[PDB]
Write a protein that binds this ligand. Structure first.
Ligand SMILES: C[S@@+](CC[C@H](N)C(=O)[O-])C[C@H]1O[C@@H](n2cnc3c(N)ncnc32)[C@H](O)[C@@H]1O
Length: 252
């Protein structure tokens, strides 16, 4: 309830990102789909097929039930397995692969990233898109130097301290009110990701902050913002949102 505005913003930004790169009849691969909280959005986008994969079976179960009890016009496929740290082959390619708030979990180890990036590339049609919303390392480290790493909504803690380079930390503890609790998150090594994808044929095409994206997309057209309880984010709510950023790659 206290995080309603934050959830509306994230869902909005997600709907805008989805509406920006998807077209009628497209096939989508939702990595880390979770409880399938995007099935509604894709249903509006008019996509023809949706495939959701998540490591947590408890979340896939919710998504199955939701897809089962929703007025959808597209075929749905669900599978509970590790799509990042384990070889995956669904046997087909998709026009768009989305990963909202979960791809950073692919940065467990160099091997986990290489495996994950390879799974995305073999399931992406030539000219296909790979959309994602992941935490921003630069943003996080900047707030570390500022001394403010939390408020009434979130809380972040880094790794070591005793003679340990600030740029050396590769993971942290994230906590969100009425959500994750002291969850282990892995930093996103942008450079390694870019170079890694560039090697598989995927090039970077977009990278924008949640706030700027939020404001821009919210002005480009009119209130779709009317639908959801959107409006004016407070400074405190903006700190939680201003944590993530949008990143898009295209298979050239
Ligand atoms: C914040 S939740 C996603 C919620 C949903 N995507 C959305 O945008 O509302 C992150 C998800 O990442 C998934 N995840 C974490 N590690 C994963 C892995 N190795 N393979 C697949 N999914 C993974 C979890 O099971 C969790 O449901």
């Amino acid at each position: 309830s206290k995080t309603i505005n934050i959830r509306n913003a994230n869902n909005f930004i997600k709907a805008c990102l989805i509406r920006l790169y998807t077209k009628r009849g497209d096939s989508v691969l939702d990595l880390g789909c979770g409880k399938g909280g995007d099935l509604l959005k894709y249903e509006r986008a008019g996509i023809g097929e949706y495939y959701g994969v998540d490591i947590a079976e408890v979340s896939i179960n919710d998504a199955r039930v939701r897809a089962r009890n929703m007025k959808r016009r597209f075929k749905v496929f669900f599978r509970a397995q590790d799509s990042y740290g384990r070889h995956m082959d669904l046997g087909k390619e998709f026009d768009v692969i989305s990963s909202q708030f979960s791809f950073h979990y692919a940065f467990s180890t160099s091997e986990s990233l290489d495996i994950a990036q390879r799974n995305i590339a073999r399931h992406l049609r030539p000219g296909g898109y790979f959309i994602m919303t992941v935490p921003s390392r630069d943003v996080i480290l900047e707030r570390y130097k500022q001394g403010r790493m939390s408020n009434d909504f979130y809380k972040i803690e880094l790794e070591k301290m005793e003679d340990v380079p600030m740029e050396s930390v590769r993971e942290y503890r994230f906590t969100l009110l009425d959500s994750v609790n002291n969850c282990i998150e892995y930093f996103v090594d942008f450079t390694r990701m870019v170079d890694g994808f560039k090697r598989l044929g995927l090039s970077l095409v977009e990278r924008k902050g949640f706030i700027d994206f939020y404001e821009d997309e919210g002005r480009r057209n009119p209130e779709l913002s009317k639908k959801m309880g959107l409006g004016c984010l407070t400074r405190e709510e903006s700190e939680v949102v201003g944590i993530y950023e949008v990143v898009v790659f295209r298979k050239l």
